[PDB]
């Protein structure tokens, strides 16, 4: 029974090596690395592999691992695909642990953005969770932490985090967790999954789909956003993406708003990303 090496990048940066049979559906792999990972509160998180386009894709748990990766290696990374609005309402400390360790990629990256405040308070949480009560012997006036904070350290945030780091003596690790995801999670970009695209005009715009619906950044001033309950219908033809809103009160016609994606992967990708939150977010 012929089986394929698979290899997993971790939310910690290491590597998951395991095998499968070459003819399994996502499911298995994602359970296996679950598994490993000692994850029971799994339906917040994913595989993700990057198509012959280098774009990065979801791994249908439903599907062949063979007919997704096709002529791609069997690579993969651990993600968080549902973030929590409120990850207080979950079970599991170790739930919060792997959403943090998402959160401080998508923070290093520029994915979520945030205040220079803000920064520095997520790094104290990080380290006070990950070293636990503040040390003057390992931290000088001149300190830089291993730990990796922001998209760009400077001196002057280093100094903040450790000014922070102090103010929490005595918290433990699943404590400090909490208080970082009460912070990263209103953050305005917080689990938005961004898609460069253009209106029905040919104006570059950015769709943002997450927990509360489909936002639209027309730029700095002026941002439109459907709630998923407003929304009936989600299709894509060709390049193009489309919405069908429910009709307003006393309103006749349902109305269908259009987008041109970068290519039809493009528009495919946006579309099942949607139905997916839509599924998700309706039913908890
Ligand atoms: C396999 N399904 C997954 C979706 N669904 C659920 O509960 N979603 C949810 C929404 C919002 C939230 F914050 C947490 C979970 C039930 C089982």
Redesign the pocket.
């Known amino acids: 029974p012929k089986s394929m090496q698979c290899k997993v990048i971790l939310l910690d940066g290491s590597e998951y090596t395991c095998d499968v049979e070459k003819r399994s559906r996502g499911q298995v792999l994602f359970d296996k690395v679950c598994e490993h990972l000692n994850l029971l509160e799994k ?2 998180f994913g595989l993700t592999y990057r198509d012959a386009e280098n774009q990065k894709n979801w791994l249908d748990p439903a599907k062949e691992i063979k007919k997704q990766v096709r002529s791609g290696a069997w690579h993969f990374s651990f993600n968080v695909k ?1 973030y ?3 990850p207080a ?1 979950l079970s599991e400390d170790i739930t919060r642990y792997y959403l943090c360790l998402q959160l401080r990629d998508d923070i290093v990256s520029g994915r979520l953005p945030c205040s220079f405040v803000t920064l520095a308070l997520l790094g104290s949480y990080t380290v006070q969770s990950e070293l636990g009560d503040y040390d003057p012997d390992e931290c000088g006036s001149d300190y830089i932490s291993e730990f990796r904070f922001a998209p760009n350290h400077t001196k002057e945030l280093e100094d903040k985090v450790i000014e922070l780091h102090k103010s929490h003596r005595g918290m433990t690790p699943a404590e400090a967790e909490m208080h970082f995801l009460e912070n990263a999670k209103k953050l305005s970009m917080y689990g938005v999954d961004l898609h460069h695209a253009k209106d029905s005009e040919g104006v570059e715009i950015m769709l943002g789909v997450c ?1 509360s619906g489909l936002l639209i950044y027309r730029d700095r001033l002026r941002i439109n956003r459907f709630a998923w309950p407003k929304v009936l219908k989600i299709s894509y033809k060709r390049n193009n993406f489309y919405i069908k809103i429910r009709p307003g009160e006393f309103e006749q016609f349902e109305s269908t708003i259009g987008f041109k994606l970068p290519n039809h992967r493009a528009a495919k990708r946006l579309w099942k990303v949607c139905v997916e939150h839509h ?6």
Not at 279 to 284: A, D, I, K, Q
């Open positions: 339906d917040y549902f929590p609005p409120d309402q927990a599924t998700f977010f309706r039913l908890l």
